[PDB]
Amino acid sequence: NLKLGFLVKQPEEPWFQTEWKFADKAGKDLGFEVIKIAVPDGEKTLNAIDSLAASGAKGFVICTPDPKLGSAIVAKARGYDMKVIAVDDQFVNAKGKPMDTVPLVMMAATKIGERQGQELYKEMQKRGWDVKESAVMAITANELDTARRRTTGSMDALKAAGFPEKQIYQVPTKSNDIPGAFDAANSMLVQHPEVKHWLIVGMNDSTVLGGVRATEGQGFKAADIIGIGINGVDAVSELSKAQATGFYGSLLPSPDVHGYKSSEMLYNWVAKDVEPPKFTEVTDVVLITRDNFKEELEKKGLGGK
Numbered sequence: 001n002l003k004l005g006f007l008v009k010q011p012e013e014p015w016f017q018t019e020w021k022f023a024d025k026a027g028k029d030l031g032f033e034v035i036k037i038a039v040p041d042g043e044k045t046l047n048a049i050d051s052l053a054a055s056g057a058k059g060f061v062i063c064t065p066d067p068k069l070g071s072a073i074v075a076k077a078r079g080y081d082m083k084v085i086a087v088d089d090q091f092v093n094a095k096g097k098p099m100d101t102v103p104l105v106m107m108a109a110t111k112i113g114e115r116q117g118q119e120l121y122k123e124m125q126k127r128g129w130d131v132k133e134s135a136v137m138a139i140t141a142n143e144l145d146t147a148r149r150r151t152t153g154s155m156d157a158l159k160a161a162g163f164p165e166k167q168i169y170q171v172p173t174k175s176n177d178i179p180g181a182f183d184a185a186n187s188m189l190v191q192h193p194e195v196k197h198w199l200i201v202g203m204n205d206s207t208v209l210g211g212v213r214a215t216e217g218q219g220f221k222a223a224d225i226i227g228i229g230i231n232g233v234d235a236v237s238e239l240s241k242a243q244a245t246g247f248y249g250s251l252l253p254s255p256d257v258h259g260y261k262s263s264e265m266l267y268n269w270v271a272k273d274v275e276p277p278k279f280t281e282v283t284d285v286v287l288i289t290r291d292n293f294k295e296e297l298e299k300k301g302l303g304g305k
């Protein structure tokens, strides 16, 4: 009967696959169908709205490939009498200011990046690294606010704990994936032969994974690297390997809550003109490592090694 879309920029990430799964659960519970579409670029984004219109959908949840497409997405949706909810990446206008009137569901990005920095520091302490030969590699995607809030929160936490500001090195990545992060990390590694141990800061698991893979290629053993990702579900293949690596763990937020809650809220809005809150910040987070990832995922209903 009722058709609602769930559009995501990166279907290759377990993070979005999970949102899709829980959106389906919400459809089952409330009685609506979820049209799952990948929107990796702006063109596909706009064409997908047209497809949704053709299928008769009344609204959609979207994680845009580009926050700057916000105006256009809103324009096309108003044109088809569709309600829109943003999940994870906030829409911004042309000047980069947030489109506050579009309901948003997202993680507490600043708080989670601060936790990442706290946990990096703690593990560094446990390994007893001499600060003098250690450094932080921050792989940033500053044009994406949610990404920026995580890496800045993480760097601020490290500086608050006493990590030397001058030994915090930032390098921008061209893509939010392993290859982009790899490339960025490699260029930074060869510039710092004096560093014997590295803390890798990145907004999500893929970003940290690319950083870790680059350190391996420059001869660092796992004991000299500490990378803590963000997303959790995206690090299960790494945490499942026989051997420990420089990727120590990941902060697991709630993609399950994001998929179900944004879908539910869309539904209520469409079916009963029940207006969603403008901002829903989910604060859940748990650190998953090789030692507790299975238990923790099972514990969250994301069952499977």
Ligand SMILES: O[C@@H]1[C@@H](O)[C@@H](O)CO[C@H]1O
Binding pocket: 013, 015, 088, 089, 144, 146, 147, 176, 203, 204, 230, 231
């Ligand atoms: O791209 C990231 C995704 O990996 C997840 O962390 C949610 O926020 C998005 O910006």
